[PDB]
Amino acid sequence: STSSPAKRPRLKCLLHIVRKLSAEHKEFITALIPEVILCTKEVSVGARKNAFALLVEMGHAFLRFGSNQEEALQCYLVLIYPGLVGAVTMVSCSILALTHLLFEFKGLMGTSTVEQLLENVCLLLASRTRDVVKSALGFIKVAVTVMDVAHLAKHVQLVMEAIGKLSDDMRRHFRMKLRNLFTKFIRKFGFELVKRLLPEEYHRVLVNIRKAEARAKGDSIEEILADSRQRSRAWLKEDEPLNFLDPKVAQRVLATQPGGFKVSADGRLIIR
Amino acid sequence: RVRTKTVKKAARVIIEKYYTRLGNDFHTNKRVCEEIAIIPSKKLRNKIAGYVTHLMKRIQRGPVRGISIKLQEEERERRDN
Amino acid sequence: VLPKKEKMKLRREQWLQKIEAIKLAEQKHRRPSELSRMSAAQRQQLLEEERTRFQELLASPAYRASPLVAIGQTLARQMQLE
RNA sequence: AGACUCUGGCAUGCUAUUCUUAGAGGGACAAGUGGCGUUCAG
């Protein structure tokens, strides 16, 4: 019985009871998992930030319950892995959660397992819903950033094949993420490989990207309300005759050079 | 969020013609924004109100001599018409 | 203005049209994907449902030995249905 | 590594109207706080 704004403080309260939670509290955590995921795709950005920080601190909390950190994080992942199975919105939620978790505990998951998730995300690249494919593209970008190029190389072809047969409209909508992914792949690998295994139309974008990689190599009112050799020039002022021996002569020696709408019938201005 | 040209040039001219009727807080800036300018776009009106609130919290910390001579000039222009 | 012969043609044609006019008159006499749009009760129902589904799949013996393999097979079945 | 256009969450308000409607009017603009900042842009 928690309302939508009330998710934003509550997670923090949950956060405030994670970082000293004892080892005999796993049931509470595994009951809290879906709330944290649904709050990672909450309406409020503050609730999303709180749920992401709660996920990070909660994964940190499993780094204290066992001797093996990698096995504990594997358990933490398999507590959230079913989220890729149910309804479309919560699948997108869980892909976003895995995207956030992949950037924090980078090597500690174990790259091969990450590769399996990447393969699953490739299946999630074939979804009809735009949010799921967007979250899959975000996870792909995070994986390209994080996990190693030597392990990327055996999985370049599958992920970019899942990219290639996306759609016409879906490719047209998210051309930004596709452009950034192609730029990252061209930076990290050979341009000829990406050209060889992509279909025809994307090649056009590629050469533009390649050309891009060619191209990359005081408090006064009047001053504030403004439309936004040489320093040795002096101006005298000539009044009484100028007395160079007067102590107050420096006031007469200056250092700089001295010196759109239509109105309506009522008189109010017109702004457009 | 980054800033544009039209909102801030409109704010500059609206201050240069009606600095007397502005206030210090956001709501009075909003009210004078409806009652002075027609401003058909609500987004542009909101941005104008935000930047004029920024301007009023900025220039009121400055010297009073410029404010006094600007009020004299505005009162002279109002009395001339 | 305009030629006489064209005017004569027009007058003859309108008089002819009146002739068949009189003749005819005489003859007649005889659950969205986005969560922000969706309501709080449905979010709570979805939260309870996904809690129960997570508990059931975590209590399943198949999801204890090969978790990632089972997840991959489930996704493969789900979108080979699609 | 979209500074392009439109636009949602909340209305116990007006309109035939607190639970369904569809026109309009509001509401959020980085507005406020503390730090980093060429003390101004961010």
Contacts of A155 (CB under 8 A, 6+ apart): A115, A118, A119
Whole-number Å distance, CA A270 to C1' D23?
A: 27
Q: Show the 3-state SS of chain A.
A: CCCCCCHHHHHHHHHCCCCCCCCCCHHHHHHHHHHHHHHHCCCCHHHHHHHHHHHHHHHHHCCCCCCCHHHHHHHHHHCCHHHHCCCHHHHHHHHHHHHHHHCCCCCCCCHHHHHHHHHHHHHHHHCCCHHHHHHHHHHHHHHHHHCCHHHHHHHHHHHHHHHHCCCCHHHHHCHHHHHHHHHHHHHHCCHHHHHHHCCHHHHHHHHHHHHHHHHCCCCCHHHHCCCCCCCCCCECCCCCCCCCCCCCCHHHCECCCCCCCCECCCCCECCC
Contacts of A157 (CB under 8 A, 6+ apart): A197
Neighbours of A189 (CB within 10 A): 15
CB of A81 closer than 8 Å to CB of C34: no
Contact A271 B44 (CB under 8 A): yes
Whole-number Å distance, CA A219 to C1' D28?
A: 29
Whole-number Å distance, CA B49 to C1' D28?
A: 11
CA distance A37 to A25: 19
CB of A183 closer than 8 Å to CB of A212: yes
Contact B37 A269 (CB under 8 A): yes
Whole-number Å distance, CA A220 to C1' D41?
A: 18
Query: C1' nearest to CA of A218: which nucleotide?
Result: D40
Q: At what angle do helices A88-102 and A45-61 cross, to 10 degrees?
A: 60
Place of tokens 């920024």: B54
Nearest protein residue, CA measured to C1' of D28: B46
Residue A11 exposed, middle or buried by CB count within 10 Å (0-12, 13-18, 19+): buried
Whole-number Å distance, CA B1 to C1' D33?
A: 19
In A, which residues are within 8 Å of B44 by CB distance?
A: 271
| CATH code of the domain occupying B1-60 | 1.10.60.20
Neighbours of A19 (CB within 10 A): 11
- Distance from the Cα of A262 to chain B's closest Cα (Å) equals 12
CA distance B19 to B77: 13
Q: Structural domain boundaries of chain B?
A: 1-60
CB of C42 closer than 8 Å to CB of C31: yes
Q: Give the resolution to one decimal, in Å.
A: 3.0
* Structure determined by: cryo-EM
In B, which residues are within 8 Å of A270 by CB distance?
A: 37-38
> Given B10, B17, B59, which is nearest A224 (Cβ)?
B59
Chain C interface, mutation test: which of A120, A122, A129, most C Cβ atoms within 10 Å?
Answer: A120
Contact C33 A3 (CB under 8 A): no
Query: C1' nearest to CA of C40: which nucleotide?
Result: D9
Contact A268 B13 (CB under 8 A): no
Nearest protein residue, CA measured to C1' of D2: A176
In A, which residues are within 8 Å of C47 by CB distance?
A: 34-35, 38
Contact A221 B13 (CB under 8 A): no
DSSP state of C3: -
Contact C51 A3 (CB under 8 A): no
Nucleotides of D under 7 A from a protein CB: 1-4, 6-10, 26-32, 40-42
Contact B37 A219 (CB under 8 A): no
